[PDB]
């Protein structure tokens, strides 16, 4: 009844908390792709999937 | 390459007002929590008097 | 950088412009080396 409604509200809140934690984990795990440029510098790659992840 | 040059020509009747006027022309005063500081207008370059 | 490095006669023809290009290329390379030293997205966002 009302206790079941409280339980499902808590379950949904925990599920969205886990989703937010997963997004935080993938962001603080994510690292830029660096590629050398004629031994002058390591240029940045991964523009397409970086922007795709940000938009998603 | 990253260092400006400013020419100052002293004379007999030279007072620190000349240095202050060069500072007013070539630099700005900005307030910081540490205190008032003075730096050249364009960043990343050292001014030479 | 490719044009100003590989192509010659730019220093003679456009001296002040190529000098500004080296002046800005040093700054970009320094910031790029900092980014390579700390390759995390949050870190490179949080640098000043």
Curated annotation (Swiss-Prot), chain A:
Domain statement: Dynein heavy chains probably consist of an N-terminal stem (which binds cargo and interacts with other dynein components), and the head or motor domain. The motor contains six tandemly-linked AAA domains in the head, which form a ring. A stalk-like structure (formed by two of the coiled coil domains) protrudes between AAA 4 and AAA 5 and terminates in a microtubule-binding site. A seventh domain may also contribute to this ring; it is not clear whether the N-terminus or the C-terminus forms this extra domain.
Name of protein: Cytoplasmic dynein 1 heavy chain 1
Subcellular location: Cytoplasm, Cytoskeleton
Subunit description: Homodimer. The cytoplasmic dynein 1 complex consists of two catalytic heavy chains (HCs) and a number of non-catalytic subunits presented by intermediate chains (ICs), light intermediate chains (LICs) and light chains (LCs); the composition seems to vary in respect to the IC, LIC and LC composition. The heavy chain homodimer serves as a scaffold for the probable homodimeric assembly of the respective non-catalytic subunits. The ICs and LICs bind directly to the HC dimer and dynein LCs assemble on the IC dimer. Interacts with DYNC1LI1; DYNC1LI1 and DYNC1LI2 bind mutually exclusive to DYNC1H1.
Parent-protein start and end of this portion: 1444 to 1499 of 4646
Function text: Cytoplasmic dynein 1 acts as a motor for the intracellular retrograde motility of vesicles and organelles along microtubules. Dynein has ATPase activity; the force-producing power stroke is thought to occur on release of ADP. Plays a role in mitotic spindle assembly and metaphase plate congression.
Top-level taxon of the source organism: Eukaryota
Disease per UniProt entry: Charcot-Marie-Tooth disease, axonal, type 2O: An axonal form of Charcot-Marie-Tooth disease, a disorder of the peripheral nervous system, characterized by progressive weakness and atrophy, initially of the peroneal muscles and later of the distal muscles of the arms. Charcot-Marie-Tooth disease is classified in two main groups on the basis of electrophysiologic properties and histopathology: primary peripheral demyelinating neuropathies (designated CMT1 when they are dominantly inherited) and primary peripheral axonal neuropathies (CMT2). Cortical dysplasia, complex, with other brain malformations 13: An autosomal dominant disorder characterized by global developmental delay with impaired intellectual development. Some patients show signs of peripheral neuropathy, such as abnormal gait and hyporeflexia. CDCBM13 is associated with variable neuronal migration defects resulting in cortical malformations.
Family statement drawn from the similarity comment of this UniProt entry: Belongs to the dynein heavy chain family.
């Amino acid at each position: 009844a009302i206790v079941k409604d409280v339980l499902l509200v808590a379950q949904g809140e925990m599920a969205l908390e886990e989703f937010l934690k997963q997004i935080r984990e993938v962001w603080n795990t994510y690292e830029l792709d660096l590629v050398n440029y004629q031994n002058k510098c390591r240029l940045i790659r991964g523009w397409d999937d970086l922007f795709n992840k940000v938009k998603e | 390459p990253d260092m400006e040059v400013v020419g100052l020509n002293f004379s007999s009747a030279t007072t620190p007002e000349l240095l202050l006027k060069t500072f007013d022309h070539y630099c700005e005063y900005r307030r910081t929590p540490n205190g008032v500081v003075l730096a050249p207008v364009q960043l990343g370059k050292w001014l030479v008097l | 950088e490719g044009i100003f490095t590989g192509s010659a006669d730019i220093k003679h023809l456009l001296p002040v412009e190529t000098q500004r290009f080296q002046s800005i290329s040093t700054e970009f390379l320094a910031l790029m080396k900092k980014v390579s030293k700390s390759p995390l997205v949050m870190d490179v966002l949080n640098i000043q």
